[PDB]
Design a binder for these strands. Structure first.
Lengths: 61, 155, 129, 227, 60, 197
RNA sequence: AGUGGUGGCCACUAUUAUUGGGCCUAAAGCGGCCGUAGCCGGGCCCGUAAGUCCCUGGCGAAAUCCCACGGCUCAACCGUGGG
RNA sequence: CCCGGGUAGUCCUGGCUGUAAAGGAUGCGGGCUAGGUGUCGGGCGAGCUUCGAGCUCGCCCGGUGCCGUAGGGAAGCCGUUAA
């Protein structure tokens, strides 16, 4: 148990498969991550981390 | 989560000790207000608005942004709704309990013999009454305002 | 629910040093806790003490020198004038002038010995020996 | 004094050292009694201490506290047994307490005194009262608390010439400890002499547990053992 | 009357003095091999680590 | 810099621990296999046995006593004591050994070596009742209470048991100046082992 | 030149527990939950200064009580002086 | 007490009665204080996986036993789910 509580969740800078939309997403989403343009699902909110479906570009703290 | 169940489970969550907004964010303070009002005019509450902002738009917290209209107050989604005639007169948190109480009351009307649900009602109305008393202390609610089930049906 | 940071802190210190650890972290950090931590360290009971900016309420880090026998916060803030001070020394200390007490006078939190010559009353806050 | 040295030489002749601690107190590179306490060896031979502290053998330095008469019993009778509690010690901060089982009075007395010799400990003394402050180890340096069984005992420093205001058991134990004035408070059943005596013993032993900076060593004239 | 002021030993791990009948130990340093390290019974039972005064070697 | 080859260290099974752990031990842990076994850090074992080599030869050969009760530790300790001239007592540690003066074998060592803390509770209790420091071979489940020197090792395999005392005797003769070089140590590792008949 | 019996009161007693008690098995946690008054309440800044603390004016009679001196042999008792 | 019968009761609907060795014989909230040890729920990291958390090992959270360092207790015993 640390003195200070850090957040385990990260953020992900992600490039979409279809329309090549670049987005920032939460590592533990609660709803289905819909792209802005094509609207396809990107991350699936599961019990733990969301199941990313696009291609990660870079993690963010 | 111990007021009634007295169970010490901690499904809470952790925020980083961040004072300044993250560098990697691209949206300026003006765009977040536009996004939240767009979501709110659809009919989303501040909690789910925030979940969507952090989920898809990827913003950690609006509270990390400082109010352009006030140097000494952190910007909150509720404050943004208030800034444009969208904040609710009844705060969301109590409104949700009101509607839950009403629907449960219908269920009890249809099912007089479920005493477990009777006790559930007995505690959730104590929650409603406690928050009503708090708001009377704080003043966000009218002094004469008093929850009544028949009036709650209207709400 | 938490009610008083100071007594919790002093109990934390005492209990942690009964087993005899080295570095103790107190979670509910406040200004009065720091003003307290000044006093006994000025008497050499503890080693370095410092404040860590957690982000919620701050933490206090202390190194223990293994000097204190018992360190506890007297709760009910008894107001005491000067000339009757001895009547309380018999209640919290093991011998003549053994250990100290902390008083919050008009001039701030500070040791009891230094208050005798400063000639100030105030409310007892804690004690240690 | 010289008689005690004579007895010390006599026992040095007769006694042959069994336990490891025996050699360096027979060979003579140990002369201080506190050499035994500081390092923390174990004592099992009664001859180890009277060489350095022969005064234990004085009749005024040994006291018989109680003579309990317990009873085992079988189908064919109640078989008695003697349990004697007695204390020994020099009057300069070294005392021991002992309980001896036996079938006669003298046997129990001997075994009790012998075992008491092994329970020797070092007693810090001082002057911590609010009225005496004389920096002489005439009393306890500070208030102390001892526990044994139900009985709890609080010994508070007192002014010079007050005497020992405590039950006769603690009276004798402290009188053999080189302490003259102390306030006493007793919690629990004090009729059971044995637990009371052991609690007093443990309180005296606990005196050494308190952390002390040298300033109060000056302030109360704190002496670790012989003054 | 000579006041034989002995030096009561002090444990290294905690700094507490050694009472007479404590089951404490005294042993030579594990790396510099000249400094005497004391270990009091309380320090011994839970086996908290100790540090050398001379070479700064750490050892349970 | 190892006193023995590291491949041979692995072969002797010293690194192999059981599926247990203790919080006081966690520092010496290397990793946990996918089955549950807990593995030691061989480097720290090397450093610890080096320090023990510095220690043990400082004391007198006759005042050092070792005791073992494990079936696989009875011959290694005997060979160790014979090599270093240290007293050895395998098997059941007799009660009252150094705590009862009137026992025929009333020997009071200035230092004691322990194979398994779990096996010989009586030994360390009697060692405490006299008050001497302690050296112990600690596997992944042993408790570190009253351990002035803890050596991480596998004290179940006979090969490791032999190798540990082999190395320790070699370091004893190094520090006492009796034997100068490793090649001078002609006694093989097999001499300390337990011969399965 | 007192000494005994008895009755009332305090201590003995931490058997009234503020200082300072217990409530698994010895008398002693109500079957459970909710909740009003009351009580006890998170961190930081600013103000007020009611409580809180230091200084100072008026005031709580005499008598009793503590101490020095003096008077009656001394004492008790009385006065002078300080508290 | 054993056996053979047998009414109220035991069952449903509405209401009353407010009871038990309703016992963990342990009132509830917070913080602190060695550890080991299994299962239940959720999450995570690996490996197995006929790819169904389907299966094995470690970790975090919540509840749920036992053993047990110190400590407590008159002891019986309690000992982070504290007495």
């Amino acid at each position: 148990k640390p003195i200070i509580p850090m957040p385990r969740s990260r953020f992900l800078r992600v490039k979409c498969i279809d329309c090549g939309n670049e987005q920032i997403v939460f590592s533990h989403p609660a709803t289905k991550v819909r792209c802005l343009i094509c609207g396809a699902t990107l991350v699936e909110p599961t019990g733990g981390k969301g199941i990313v479906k696009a291609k990660i570009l870079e993690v963010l703290e | 989560a111990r007021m009634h169940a007295r169970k010490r489970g901690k499904s809470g969550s952790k925020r980083p000790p961040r004072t300044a907004p993250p560098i990697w964010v691209e949206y300026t303070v003006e765009e977040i207000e536009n996004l939240v009002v767009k979501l709110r005019k659809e009919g989303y509450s501040t909690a789910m608005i925030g979940t969507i902002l952090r989920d898809q738009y990827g913003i950690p917290s609006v509270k990390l942004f400082k109010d352009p209209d006030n140097p000494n107050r952190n910007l909150t989604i509720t404050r943004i709704l208030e800034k444009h005639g969208l904040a609710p007169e009844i705060p969301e948190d109590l409104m949700f309990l009101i509607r839950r109480a009403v629907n449960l009351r219908k269920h009890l009307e249809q099912h007089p013999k479920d005493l477990h649900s009777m006790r559930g009602l007995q505690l959730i109305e104590s929650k409603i009454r406690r928050l009503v008393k708090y708001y009377k202390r704080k003043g966000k609610l009218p002094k004469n305002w008093r929850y009544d089930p028949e009036t709650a049906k209207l709400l | 629910t938490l009610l008083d940071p100071l007594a919790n802190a002093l109990s934390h210190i005492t209990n942690s040093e009964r087993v005899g650890k080295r570095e103790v972290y107190i979670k509910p950090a406040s200004k009065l806790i720091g003003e307290v931590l000044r006093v006994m360290q000025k008497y050499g009971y503890i080693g370095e003490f410092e404040f860590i900016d957690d982000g919620r309420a701050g933490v206090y880090r202390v190194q223990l020198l293994g000097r204190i026998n018992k360190a506890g916060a007297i709760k009910p803030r008894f107001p005491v004038k000067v000339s009757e001070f001895e009547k309380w020394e018999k209640r919290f200390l093991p011998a003549f002038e053994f250990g100290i007490l902390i008083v919050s006078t008009s001039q701030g939190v500070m040791s009891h010995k230094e208050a005798i010559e400063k000639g100030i009353g105030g409310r007892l806050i804690a004690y240690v020996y | 004094s010289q008689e005690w040295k004579e007895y010390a030489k006599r026992v040095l002749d007769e006694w042959e050292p069994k336990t490891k601690l025996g050699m360096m107190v027979k060979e003579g590179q140990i002369t201080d009694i506190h050499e035994i306490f500081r390092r923390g060896y174990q004592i099992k031979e009664p001859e180890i201490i009277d060489v350095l502290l022969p005064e234990v053998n004085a009749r005024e330095n040994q006291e018989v506290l109680d003579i309990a008469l317990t009873v085992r019993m079988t189908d064919s009778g109640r078989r008695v047994r003697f349990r004697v509690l007695a204390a020994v010690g020099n009057r300069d901060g070294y005392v021991g307490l002992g309980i001896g089982h036996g079938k006669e009075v003298g046997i129990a007395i001997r075994k009790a005194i012998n075992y008491a010799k092994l329970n020797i400990i070092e007693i810090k003394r001082g002057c911590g009262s609010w009225e005496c402050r004389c920096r002489r180890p005439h009393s306890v340096p500070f208030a102390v608390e001892g526990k044994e069984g139900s009985v709890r005992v609080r010994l508070i420093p007192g002014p010079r010439g007050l005497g020992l205001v405590i039950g006769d058991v603690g009276k004798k134990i402290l009188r053999l400890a080189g302490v003259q004035d102390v306030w006493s408070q007793t919690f629990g059943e004090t009729r059971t002499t044995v637990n009371f005596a052991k609690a007093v013993f443990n309180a005296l032993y606990n005196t050494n547990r308190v952390a002390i900076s040298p300033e109060m060593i000056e302030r109360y004239g704190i002496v670790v053992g012989r003054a | 009357m000579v006041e034989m002021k002995f030096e009561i030993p002090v444990c290294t791990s905690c700094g507490r003095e050694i009472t007479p009948r404590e089951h404490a130990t005294h042993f030579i340093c594990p790396n510099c091999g000249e400094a005497v390290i004391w270990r009091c019974e309380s320090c011994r039972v839970l086996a908290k680590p100790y540090k050398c005064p001379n070479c700064g070697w750490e050892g349970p | 810099e190892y006193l023995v080859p590291l491949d041979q260290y692995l072969a002797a099974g010293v690194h192999i621990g059981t599926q247990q752990k203790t919080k006081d031990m966690k520092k010496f842990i290397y990793r946990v296999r996918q089955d549950g076994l807990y593995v030691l850090d061989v480097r720290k074992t090397d450093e610890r046995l080096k320090v023990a080599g510095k220690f043990l030869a400082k004391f007198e050969p006759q005042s050092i006593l070792a005791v073992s009760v494990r079936l696989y530790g009875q011959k290694p300790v005997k060979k160790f004591g014979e090599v270093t001239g240290a007293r050895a007592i395998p098997g059941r540690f007799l009660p009252g050994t150094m705590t009862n003066p009137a026992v025929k074998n009333f020997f009071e060592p200035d230092v004691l070596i322990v194979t398994d803390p779990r096996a010989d509770h009586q030994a360390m209790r009697e060692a405490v009742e006299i008050g001497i420091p302690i050296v112990a071979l600690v596997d992944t489940e042993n408790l570190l209470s009253y351990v002035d020197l803890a050596i991480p090792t596998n004290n179940k395999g006979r090969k490791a048991l032999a190798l540990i005392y082999w190395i320790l005797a070699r370091e004893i003769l190094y520090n006492r100046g009796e034997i100068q070089s490793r090649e001078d140590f002609k006694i093989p590792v097999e001499e300390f082992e337990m011969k399965i008949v």
